[PDB]
Paper text:
The I-BAR domain protein [name] is a key player in these processes, acting as a hub that integrates signaling cues from Rho-GTPases and phosphorylation pathways to initiate cytoskeleton and membrane remodeling events. In the inactive state, the SH3 domain binds intramolecularly to the CRIB-PR domain, resulting in a compact, closed conformation. Here, we show that phosphorylation of two pairs of sites within this region triggers the binding of 14-3-3 to [name], which inhibits membrane binding and the interactions of Cdc42 with the CRIB-PR domain and cytoskeletal effectors with the SH3 domain. In all the structures, the phosphate group on the phosphorylated side chain engages a cluster of basic residues in 14-3-3θ, consisting of K49, R56, and R127, and additionally forms a hydrogen bond with the hydroxyl group of Y128.
Therefore, to study the binding of 14-3-3θ to the pT340/pT360 and pT340/pS366 pairs, we determined five crystal structures, allowing for direct comparisons of the structures of singly- vs. doubly-phosphorylated complexes. In contrast, the Sites 2,3 (pT340/pT360) and Sites 2,4 (pT340/pS366) peptides bound 14-3-3θ with ~0.5:1 stoichiometry (i.e., one peptide per 14-3-3θ dimer) and with more than two orders of magnitude higher affinities (Kd of 45 nM and 67 nM, respectively) than the corresponding singly-phosphorylated peptides. This result suggested that these doubly phosphorylated peptides occupy the two phospho-S/T-binding pockets of 14-3-3θ. Importantly, the structures of the singly-phosphorylated peptides display distinctive features that are recognizable in those of the doubly-phosphorylated peptides, for which the electron density is asymmetric in the two pockets of 14-3-3θ. Although the sequences surrounding pT340 and pT360 are closely related to each other, they are distinguishable by the presence of two large side chains in the Site 1 peptide, Y337, and R344, occupied by smaller side chains in the Site 2 peptide, E357, and S365, respectively. These distinctive features of the singly-phosphorylated peptides are clearly discernable in the structures of the doubly-phosphorylated peptides, in which each pocket of 14-3-3θ binds a different site in an asymmetric manner. We note, however, that the structure of the pT340/pT360 pair contains four complexes in the P1 unit cell, and only one of these complexes has a unique N- to C-terminal orientation of the doubly phosphorylated peptide, whereas the other three complexes appear to have a mixture of orientations. In the structures, ranging in resolution from 2.0 to 2.9 Å, the electron density maps revealed the phosphorylated residue and 3 to 5 residues N- and C-terminal to it, whereas the ends of the peptides and the flexible linkers between phosphorylation sites in the doubly-phosphorylated peptides were unresolved.
Author numbering:
A (entry chain C): 337 to 345, 357 to 365
B (entry chain B): 1 to 69, 73 to 230
C (entry chain A): 1 to 230
Write the structure that this text describes.
């Protein structure tokens, strides 16, 4: 897609959020 | 809650990526009646951009899945309609804020340009999911807002100003995406870019960060649209 | 609606990253009463991990800002109240998950795989409660977490090869419980490294589909060991 403004946005365990 | 405490909570939510809370904070600030600094305008823009863009991405994913597709298709269309309803709700909220509080009581030409650009943005988001005469009218409103912002910005602002550049960026995207003319979108992005480069030695330091980035984005679009 | 439609809708939400709706779908599926398949357990796990991780991250950021500022300030009370809000909704999420585990899933689990899985989920979410609890509520949540983890760890030692990705994820999270909750780096490292080594020995005899997950989890074990050693 074409750019536009504005844009959107410890120990390791499982599962992990996406 | 009081404006200072309110925008404090807004920054707090921002750093916590709690964009719904941030958006309600900034809506309360706006509905208080007073105008917004550049930083507070940015807070409101970022908050509502995040909340609406979650649903924009969801809608694109779902419409894509629908194109490749059956009771399945019925469920897909109903879910897409749900997401569209949420998107229209958010866009109506933002546009109502713009009409009543922000655009009406804006002091500067720069703030007016910013709010008009934002109105163009959210009418464009509404048009991304529109059909029939509603689509025509939403495109009409988005283009009208962008064109007024563009005229005022080139009347009262220099080409290097970050607000003008961001307006050119999103208006070029509007031409490429909604009206579907690559040549005109390219010409708009490129004229903004070249006009900014023409001066540039006049740009003050405060804007160095924003302008530069925006200009890169311009060039990126022009690269993506020449392939 | 019957399972089929709920599963389609939950999967579509996962594709759209609408994790709230996914979680609602999978809660309905669970509450239908029947036993879940591996597909459905993965959907439930993914959905709820996603709905709780946002609250966990927000809480961590807010609490790093809280302890990073001066005391006896009015600015501070707002931050603390906000932290309490996020804590409240995180506790509500965890309570939902734990209720699903206590009323439906664990009780009717028929195979040891599902038992290990649900007990690991119980431990995970009681640990999520512990990381935000105080005093006696903290003691309660820690005890429940550790008990669930321990039951799963024994069941897994007795019923699973050391390469099974569920057993390895259990070991990872249990060592993390030892390091973060109990503040025991030595035993966290020992648990994680034991799982690691016992897995490495039997690795050549293993399935590719399981290879991806198992080697991922072992890599995570090694990374946690490197972080805890530093």
């Amino acid at each position: 897609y074409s750019n536009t403004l504005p844009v959107r946005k410890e120990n390791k365990t499982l599962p992990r959020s996406s | 809650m009081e404006k200072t405490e309110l925008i404090q909570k807004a920054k707090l939510a921002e750093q916590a990526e709690r964009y719904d809370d941030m958006a309600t904070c900034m809506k309360a600030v706006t509905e208080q009646g007073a105008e917004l600094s550049n930083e507070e305008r940015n807070l409101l823009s970022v908050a509502y951009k995040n909340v609406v863009g979650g649903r924009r991405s969801a809608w694109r994913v779902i419409s894509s899945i629908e194109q490749k597709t059956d009771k399945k298709l019925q469920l897909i269309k109903d879910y897409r309609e749900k997401v569209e309803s949420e998107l229209r709700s958010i866009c109506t909220t933002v546009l109502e804020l713009l009409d009543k509080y922000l655009i009406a009581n804006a002091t500067n030409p720069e703030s007016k340009v910013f709010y008009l650009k934002m109105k163009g943005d959210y009418f464009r988001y509404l048009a991304e999911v529109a059909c029939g005469d509603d689509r025509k009218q939403t495109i009409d409103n988005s283009q009208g807002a962008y064109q007024e912002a563009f005229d005022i910005s080139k009347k009262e602002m220099q080409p290097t100003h970050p607000i003008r550049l961001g307006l050119a960026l999103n208006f070029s995207v509007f031409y490429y995406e909604i009206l579907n003319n690559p040549e005109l979108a390219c010409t708009l992005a490129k004229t903004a870019f070249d006009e900014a480069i023409a001066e540039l030695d006049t740009l003050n330091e405060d804007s160095y960060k924003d302008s530069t980035l925006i200009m890169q984005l311009l060039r990126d679009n022009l690269t993506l649209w020449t392939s």
